């Protein structure tokens, strides 16, 4: 299984900036979503989910084929809630119909992070829509009620080491859990939508109480009103992870750089980029374009 990247016919960087801008402008506009959190968070989640299906052993899954668009993938229970990101992106694809889905789902995540003040994420186009046949079965996404070994194990499937993992988890500083979607509740009830190293700080400085929630699942609840899933908490129970957490707790820059590299890698897993491929583009934010 090879997936070679194929640039959308005749498109160039400027063509992609525009898609980016459209998404960005729309995020700005639709600020009421989920109690005023914005779609930032949800788009980040989408991009990681259409990407975490990848399986380094047989090259199946991954963002290339934009299979999230098919029922089977779209109905993935681990996918609950994601449908709102999709509906967000809808009209945008309608405006730029030559962009493939994998390119769009992925770019939304990128636009998201950056417009939330994250670090820039270099991104490459070229993903190709593949047939329904190629949709991976459900069940390739991680559960949250496990520990550090699980996490370590799970992520190896995607080629990520300790470091990538901890860095990537820092997206957890964003948005929130929704009982109806996954069985977790919190945080109570004003969330964050600015990308900072806030996750690691919360992990180290709060007084976590393990509790069961209304759905019968365990979660770490803090006085201040924050929450962390078991998989999250586990980052502090493992010796190796713990030191990286601390590192990120102390230097947002380091965190941003590693986050950037890992998120890109994550979004490119399984794709093969021909030699003559264009370099990765680095999008300008609205602000930088004075829009
Ligand atoms: C062990 C790995 C992980 C597990 C089990 C996991 C599980 C979860 C859970 C259960 C949700 C809450 C869903 C809800 O009720 O709406 C969630 C929220 C989300 N996850 Fe993850 N997560 C992990 C990895 C990732 C990674 C790598 C990313 C991004 C880089 C990420 C980004 C987020 C985002 C942004 C949200 C908040 C979404 C919202 O506000 O709607 N998580 N994650």
From Swiss-Prot:
Keywords: Heme, Hydrogen peroxide, Iron, Metal-binding, Mitochondrion, Organic radical, Oxidoreductase, Peroxidase, Phosphoprotein, Transit peptide. One of its GO terms (biological process) is hydrogen peroxide catabolic process. The record marks 45 as: Transition state stabilizer. It comes from the Eukaryota. One of its GO terms (molecular function) is heme binding. The active site is at residues 49, 188. CCP1 precursor is processed by the rhomboid protease PCP1, which cleaves the N-terminal hydrophobic transit peptide. The m-AAA protease (composed of YTA12/RCA1 and YTA10/AFG3) is required for CCP1 maturation: m-AAA protease promotes membrane dislocation of the CCP1 transmembrane segment within the transit peptide to ensure the correct positioning of CCP1 within the membrane bilayer, allowing intramembrane cleavage by PCP1. Binds 1 heme b (iron(II)-protoporphyrin IX) group per subunit. It catalyses: 2 Fe(II)-[cytochrome c] + H2O2 + 2 H(+) = 2 Fe(III)-[cytochrome c] + 2 H2O. This is Cytochrome c peroxidase, mitochondrial. It comes from Saccharomyces cerevisiae (strain ATCC 204508 / S288c). The gene is CCP1.
């Amino acid at each position: 299984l090879v997936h070679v990247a194929s640039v959308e016919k005749g498109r160039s960087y400027e063509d992609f900036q525009k898609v980016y801008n459209a998404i960005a402008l729309k995020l700005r506009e639709d600020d009421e979503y989920d109690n005023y959190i914005g779609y930032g968070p949800v788009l980040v989640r989408l991009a990681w989910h259409i990407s975490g299906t990848w399986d380094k052993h047989d090259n199946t899954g991954g963002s290339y084929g934009g299979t999230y668009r098919f029922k089977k993938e779209f109905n993935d229970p681990s996918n609950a809630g994601l449908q709102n990101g999709f509906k967000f992106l809808e009209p945008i694809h309608k405006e730029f119909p030559w962009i493939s889905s994998g390119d769009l789902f992925s770019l939304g995540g990128v636009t998201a992070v950056q417009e939330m003040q994250g670090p820039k994420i270099p991104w490459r186009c070229g993903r190709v829509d593949t047939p329904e046949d190629t949709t991976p079965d459900n069940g390739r996404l991680p559960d949250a009620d496990k520990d550090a070994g699980y996490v370590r194990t799970f992520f190896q499937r995607l080629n990520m080491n300790d470091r990538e993992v901890v860095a990537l988890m820092g997206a957890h500083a964003l948005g929130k859990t929704h009982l109806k979607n996954s069985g977790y509740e919190g945080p109570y009830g004003a969330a964050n939508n600015v990308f900072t190293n806030e996750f690691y700080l919360n992990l180290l400085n709060e007084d976590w109480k393990l509790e069961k929630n209304d759905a019968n699942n365990e979660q770490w609840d803090s006085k201040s009103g924050y929450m962390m899933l078991p998989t999250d908490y586990s980052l502090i129970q493992d010796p190796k992870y713990l030191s990286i957490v601390k590192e990120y707790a102390n230097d947002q820059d380091k965190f941003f750089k590693d986050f950037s590299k890992a998120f890109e890698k994550l979004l490119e897993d399984g794709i093969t980029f021909p030699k003559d491929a264009p370099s990765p583009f680095i999008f300008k934010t609205l602000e930088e374009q004075g829009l």
